[PDB]
């Protein structure tokens, strides 16, 4: 019944060791040299969502102690209570005693410590340094402003840069090795550009386009399948809509917008982002154009975030683009 193949691709391909963590080479190398030399100071991982922080720290805990990491290592994620009455009793008692199985330094992993109250961090500020020669703290976080400056200073800061194109490409190749599948180069480029650094969105849309093949053993995943699985607008009709808005008149521009956004069931929130990304490359010969072009589009996006209407906002986008592309003449 239960096996490794039932897990979703988000977790099925979790890096077991540090060797299976691509991208963050400049941090994995330093961590491996830390654990090799014998010294491992208080760490603080800080990175965007889905970069490899938790996987890296779990692989490190496995490498240090053994194949049984969740035995002498404490782990306080956001699922457990982490009030001041917890950092007083539990963390202090764990940091004040020895291990039960072997003789080594203890590891405490405070995952997502940005969700801790200021009093809890202020209490941890002294217990993190009172017992140093026996335990080590690892603070994982995504927002580096929730942490107080004191706790932020006591830990060595390691930033997890978003995965570059080469790392995601290597991971895609490794996944395509284990799973019988074929993926097109232009589809690969589209997937990389849609990833936005997120390693989880990659595997999610990959499982989706694999499921939408009807025979995931012979036919290759083309760009159309990827664009359909997430409903993202293809660059083709996106550039077509932008050109029709910039050049044509009002009636035909509204008609072609309503025809493109109804041919595949696109969303205006994605069209706005696509048009912004395509139009950021233009060379506007004035500063007053870009100011309005960004302000009105951001206002329309914030209004879409509340879901007022659906066509009034589209015509508002059209009008904002047209009125912004008027100071040029």
């Amino acid at each position: 019944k239960r096996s490794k193949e039932n897990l979703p691709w988000v977790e099925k391909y979790r890096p077991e060791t540090l060797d299976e963590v691509y991208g963050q080479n400049e941090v994995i190398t330093t961590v491996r040299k830390f654990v090799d030399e014998g010294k491992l100071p208080h760490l603080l991982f800080y990175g965007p969502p889905g970069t490899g922080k938790t996987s890296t720290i779990v692989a490190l805990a496995r490498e240090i102690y053994g194949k049984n990491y969740s035995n002498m290592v404490l782990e306080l994620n956001a699922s457990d209570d982490r009030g001041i009455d917890v950092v007083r009793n539990q963390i202090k008692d764990f940091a004040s005693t020895r291990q039960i199985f072997s003789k080594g330094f203890k590891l405490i992993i405070l995952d997502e410590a940005d969700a801790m109250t200021n009093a809890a961090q202020n209490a941890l500020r002294r217990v993190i340094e009172r017992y140093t020669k026996n335990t080590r703290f690892c603070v994982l976080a995504n927002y580096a402003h929730k942490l107080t400056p004191a706790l932020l200073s006591r830990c060595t800061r390691f930033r997890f840069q978003p995965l570059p194109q080469e790392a995601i490409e290597r991971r895609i190749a490794n996944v395509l090795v284990h799973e019988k599948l074929k993926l097109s180069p232009n589809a690969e480029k589209a997937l990389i550009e849609l990833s936005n650094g997120d390693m989880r969105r990659v595997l999610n849309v990959l499982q989706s386009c694999k499921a939408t093949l009807d025979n995931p053993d012979e036919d290759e995943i083309s760009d159309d399948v990827i664009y359909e699985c997430c409903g993202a607008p293809r660059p083709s009709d996106l550039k077509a809509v932008l050109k029709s808005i910039l050049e044509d008149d009002w009636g035909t521009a509204h008609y072609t917008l309503n025809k493109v956004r109804s041919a595949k069931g696109l969303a205006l929130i994605d069209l706005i982002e696509g048009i912004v990304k395509i139009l950021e490359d233009y060379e506007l010969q004035n500063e007053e154009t870009r100011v309005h072009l960004l302000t009105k589009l951001a206002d329309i996006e914030y209004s879409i975030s509340k879901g007022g209407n659906d066509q009034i906002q589209g015509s508002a986008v059209i009008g904002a683009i047209k009125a912004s592309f008027e100071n040029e003449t």
């Binding site: 404490l74 539990q90 008692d93 005693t97 291990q99 039960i100």
Partner: protein
Amino acid sequence: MLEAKFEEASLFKRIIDGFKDCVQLVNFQCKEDGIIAQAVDDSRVLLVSLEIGVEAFQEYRCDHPVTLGMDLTSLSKILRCGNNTDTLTLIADNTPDSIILLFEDTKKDRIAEYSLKLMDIDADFLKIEELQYDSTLSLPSSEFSKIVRDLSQLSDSINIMITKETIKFVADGDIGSGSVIIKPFVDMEHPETSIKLEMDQPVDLTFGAKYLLDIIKGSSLSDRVGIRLSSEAPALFQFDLKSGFLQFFLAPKFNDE
């Protein structure tokens, strides 16, 4: 299948009451030898290990080794809603599912069938108690409880020092200190009051007061507590049952000095 019919009802209640408020989630392994269990504290400092053979059970039938994970709060809730005069039977199907606790009176037909949904605890079965201990001792439970709950009012740490035919419990706090020194002696008229000591090296090590106060709650089961101490090893506090034994593995507190 798994069918374990006890002789009485309050036996399992008293057995669970030893580590009621000490551990939260346990996992009973049932085999042909008997029921074994081991569970780590919330702070991963002490471990409760219970072994009950087929001697305390009125009837026992287990074909293949089964593992049954469950929380102690719901288990205590189920044991509390049963009258202490019934007969208790643990029942498990072929595959490990919700365990069936069945209370059946001996005079009037009262079938109380409660279900308990299992938790999915990772089966990290641990193997301790094969380490040669430096010092072993045994003394009545009442004396240990008195000494520990008297020393707990002065501090939060307790230093146990086993020296040449001497046992020393030392509490050092803010308002004062306290030192209880006992010596091994055996009586012929009362073999249960004797304190036995077998040492190889003098051992001095500290523990917390909260964990000791939680451990001594198991003194309601037996009357002769055994203590095994060793440097770089968890202290073993053993209560001997009529069929098995309940042992607490406590972690010593290191000294900065």
